[PDB]
Amino acid sequence: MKQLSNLCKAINNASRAGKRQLLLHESNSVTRDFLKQMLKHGYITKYSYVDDKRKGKTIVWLNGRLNKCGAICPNYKVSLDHIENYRSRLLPARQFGHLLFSTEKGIIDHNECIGSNLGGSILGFFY
Amino acid sequence: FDLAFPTEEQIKKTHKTKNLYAVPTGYFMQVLCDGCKGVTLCYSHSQRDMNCKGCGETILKSTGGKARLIGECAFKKVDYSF
Amino acid sequence: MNGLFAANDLIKSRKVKRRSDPYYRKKILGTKYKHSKIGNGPQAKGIVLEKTGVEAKQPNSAVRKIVKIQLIKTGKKISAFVPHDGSLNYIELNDEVVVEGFGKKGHSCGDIPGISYKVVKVQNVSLLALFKGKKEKP
Amino acid sequence: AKMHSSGRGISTSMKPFSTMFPTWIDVSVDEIKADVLKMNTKGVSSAEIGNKLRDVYGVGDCKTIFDGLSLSRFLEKEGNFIEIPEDVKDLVKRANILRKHINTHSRDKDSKYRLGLIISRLNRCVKHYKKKLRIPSTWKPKLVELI
Amino acid sequence: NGTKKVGISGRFGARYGSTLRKRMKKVLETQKKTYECRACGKTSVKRDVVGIWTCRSCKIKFAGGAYAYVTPAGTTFNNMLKQ
Amino acid sequence: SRRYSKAVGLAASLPLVVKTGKYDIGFKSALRNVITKKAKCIVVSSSLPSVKRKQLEYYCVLAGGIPLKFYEGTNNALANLCELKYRTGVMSVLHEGESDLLTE
Amino acid sequence: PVKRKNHGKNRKNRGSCKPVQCDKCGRCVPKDKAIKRFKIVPLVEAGSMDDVKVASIYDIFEVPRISYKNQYCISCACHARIVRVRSRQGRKIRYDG
RNA sequence: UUCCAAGAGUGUGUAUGAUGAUUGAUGCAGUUAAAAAGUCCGUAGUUUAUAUUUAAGAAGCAAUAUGAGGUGUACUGUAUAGUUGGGAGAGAGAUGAAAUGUGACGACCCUGACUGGACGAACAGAAGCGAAAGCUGUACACUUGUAUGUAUUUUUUGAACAAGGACGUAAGCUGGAGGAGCGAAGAUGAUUAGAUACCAUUGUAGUUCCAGCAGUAAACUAUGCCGACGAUGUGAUAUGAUAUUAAUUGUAUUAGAUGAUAGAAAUUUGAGUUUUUUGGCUCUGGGGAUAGUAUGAUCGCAAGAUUGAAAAUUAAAGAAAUUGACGGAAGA
Ligand SMILES: [Mg+2]
Ligand SMILES: [Mg+2]
Ligand SMILES: [Mg+2]
Ligand SMILES: [Mg+2]
Ligand SMILES: [Mg+2]
Ligand SMILES: [Mg+2]
Ligand SMILES: [Mg+2]
Ligand SMILES: [Mg+2]
Ligand SMILES: [Mg+2]
Ligand SMILES: [Mg+2]
Ligand SMILES: [Mg+2]
Ligand SMILES: [Mg+2]
Ligand SMILES: [Mg+2]
Ligand SMILES: [Mg+2]
Ligand SMILES: [Zn+2]
Ligand SMILES: [Zn+2]
Ligand SMILES: [Zn+2]
Secondary structure, eight states: OHHHHHHHHHHHHHHHHTOSEEEESOOOHHHHHHHHHHHHTTSSOOEEEEOOSSSOEEEEEOOSOOSOEEEOSSOOBOOGGGHHHHHHHHOSOSSSOEEEEEETTEEEOHHHHHHTTOOOEEEEEEO | OOSSSOOHHHHHHSOSSSSSSOOOOOOEEEEEOSSSOOEEEEESSOSSOOBOSSSOOBOOOOOSSSOOOOSSOOEEEOOOOO | OOOTTOHHHHHHHHHHHGGGOHHHHHHHHTHHHHSOSSOSSSOEEEEEEEEEEEEOOSSOOOEEEEEEEEESSSOOEEEEEOOSTTOTTTOOSSOEEEEEEOSSSSSOOTTOOSOOEEEEEETTEEHHHHHHTSSOOO | OOSSSOOOOOOOOOOOSSOOOOOOOOSOHHHHHHHHHHHHHHTOOHHHHHHHHHHTSOOOOTTTTTTSOOHHHHTGGGTOOOSSOHHHHHHHHHHHHHHHHHTTOSSOOHHHHHHHHHHHHHHHHHHHHTTTTOSOSSOOOOOOOOO | OOOSSOGGGGGGOSOSOSHHHHHHHHHHHHHSOOEEOTTTOOEEEEEEETTEEEESSSOOEEEOOSSSSSOHHHHHHHHHHHO | OOOOOOOOSHHHHTHHHHHHSEEEESHHHHHHHHHTTOOSEEEEOTTSOHHHHHHHHHHHHHHSSOOEEEOOSOHHHHHHHTTOSSOOSEEEEEEOSSOOTTTO | OOOOSSSSSOOOSOOOOOEEEOSSSOOEEESSSOEEEEEEEESSOSTTTTTTTSSOSSSSOOOOEEEEEEEEOHHHHHHTTSSOOOOSTTTTOOOOO
16 A cells, blocks of 8 residues: 555644645545545545656545544454444543444445445545 | 646647647648749658759658758748548 | 565564673573572582681772581582671581572672572571570571 | 666656547558558658658658557568567667677676676567467577677 | 596596695696587597697687687787787 | 677678678689689688698789788688578679779 | 864775875874875075176076975874964865966 | 551462563564674565556657766876996985995996886866766777757556576785785884884785686665655756846756754754554564674685574663863864
């Protein structure tokens, strides 16, 4: 996951300094499903990406609500009974935070992973 | 000052590979001789010496950058004519 | 060596690095069976041969009273330290003693040099009680 | 970023997006198919052909005047099949110059270091080709001997 | 093939010393070797007498050294005559 | 930079003869082409015997205007210059292609 | 700790330099890690400037000067007070000519 | 004598766990405290950019741009030393100060000619090239890098590496050539309680060339290799565009200053993006001392090199920085 970690490190540098926009020189189908989950819960504004018969580009507009985003490598196979263990490790409080799992239904939250009783490989976290 | 919508000065600053949209900088041209009137197909950055059609002599020459026109020989770019 | 399918290379590497633990190295070689001074037990028995004193290190100054014995289980010669005041007057030669250790993992503690054992019983009479005066020596 | 040296240069050449049929040519299409078979049967490289075809004739991309076929693929349809590709053949020719050079000058050991880098660059291409079944399996390049 | 590092001097056996047999291996390699003929171009020149080298095919004798076909002090004086 | 200077003399013109022309080697074949006037040019090496060499100079004037070119090398060198099966004393050129051997 | 930024000398992107020799002691020193001075002295003294004027067969002439370059190791240099110990915060000043 | 803790129990001792984030997958550290092989190539094992069709890589042009990159033939530069023809007739040379040594079979100085060996002054830089060790007289021959431009071929051929392979200042070894200056070992003159050391006079191996072994350095940027993002100002090397005699601009390296971060601190565009710890891969360390010492195995003509413990011991060893005291240390 070279492309996913390269995305997350550029955001933490940008969101801490307080910039408005961001331009990256690589696009990927894993990163596009990442941002749609970030767009759904309301952490960022709109974003866009350009195809140019090359690696592709990505343009995102921030609003200043991110604390830290991250990625985990290697991608561990987690069963259904250990999601309660991982959630205590990587999250500050029980009331908020999010996780992304690469389940066969799609990249979904840990709330939907428990609610549909599906365990899979883990991707990353953001809050 | 938008990154998604660049202005024409910011296009003039950037490298040709790191633009928002990939457009090359090579085109084809037609050179007109001064004494005789012959036209010849040519290139922006040619790698070899072209000669005039009639009166075979020096017209372009290979350089590190753009091609050098020897003498007074006016040219223009050509394009699609469908 | 961080990978999902790298368990064979991870276990082989971490066994090598574990050998530089100074406590774990003696467990592999089994030095407590090879080079033990007293054997493997809490106490021992012996026969007294000498009654001699030593002199402690700097900056203190005294004379520490000891005794050179010979063990029964192994047959070696060793020295032990008489641990209380006026207790050497009970001890005669050609007698039996019982020896207990100091409790600092095989090292010498205090300012007594090179000695790691102390006497506890003489003729099946407790020396801690005999200093108190409860019993009498036959 | 380079294979056998430390460089990070970016100086390349970019072909355009969605190239259509060129109309500014002055020589007809059947004549431009005639001379390219004269060049290949005479023995010039396929990389040298695209250089000349851009300069003196006026067509830049060689995919459009043909029927959407690449240049090495287009030659196969008319019997001129290339057995060993060109990246192998230029490397064995460059290697024979240095073995010629060492037989005169023996004390030059800077050149002996240069032989190891190019031969190791040769074997990484041949070993991958035998996986793809491009060259026959019992093929060895012909090298000059060393005295 | 049977010998590890002695070579042609294995005929001497286990006598005459160690460094005396090293000096025999340098000389006996260049004496028994055949060389190219400068006249005909074939590799048939052999030695038969001290200072006389002759070819098998063209049968032309050449003067030379004791144990080598060319002498290292013999070739340096050819270069100064070429200039 | 890298630039290899091209060979200019008959060292360059001779490998073009073997690819695009017809030839024969051997002294016996070299005498036959001179008598029947079917040879164009003759290339000799430096290692011919002195008797067989001057016989070819005397006969080439008698056969006509056939030229003779002198190579400075051994038979093993001439087989390394252009690829031949065996080492050769003399070379006889029956027909040529794109070579500039006669115009030189 | 480290005392100076460039460690002893001003050499970068190289591997080695051939050594030169001091004039007073005569020990080998690399050419970067040397102390070199330049001075120009005339042949005649200023104290003898007027006395040559009464002895000149010529009418007017110029008095000539010669130059010199010297090299030293740093042991000889500080002993002859060519180069002195400076303050720590004042070590970073560089007097180019 | 009196007080405290536990209480039908309470202490002493030998193993073995936890304390220990001092075995670290979660989860340690590798400039200076212990710790990155001298530098590259390359197999097994580990690993991977992709909207499945395209970047990167490899091959190939132009400017014959630019460069103490390498190897070989031919010439050339002054100086030190020696042989010799003229002139002349007492000291020359060294040191803080002197002594042995040295000169009327004539030195030392100024001149006229010769033979040999070593080395390229001044220009000469916080400037260039090389994987590292390294690389400065001229003209040709052979041979080789990185970077900038660009509608050129192929289509994923990639990064790092147990086994194996090559190069590697300086000494040191066997064989042949040479030997001007310098010079370990050895021998003399002074200083000294004593000098077999510093000072001075001699003097051999060596340092020069060719063919081979050998494989150690404070081989140091004491900082492994690949990949994404970063604040202004003054410079340097190469090269392209705009523009035209007046400038401001693109890419790749590199020097320095001020802020900002991080750090135990000195310091610092990475040694930053870390207890809100994860992009991939090889090697090394676990309190001092014994000790890079014994023993075994593999290399080498030898000297020696790589691998590499323990018994008995000991409460400290160590890194950065403030205040004093001292200097046979320096200035005002
Ligand atoms: Mg205890
Ligand atoms: Mg590599
Ligand atoms: Mg060095
Ligand atoms: Mg620790
Ligand atoms: Mg230290
Ligand atoms: Mg250290
Ligand atoms: Mg010079
Ligand atoms: Mg550069
Ligand atoms: Mg491994
Ligand atoms: Mg190895
Ligand atoms: Mg070697
Ligand atoms: Mg070492
Ligand atoms: Mg080191
Ligand atoms: Mg290193
Ligand atoms: Zn014209
Ligand atoms: Zn013969
Ligand atoms: Zn000095």
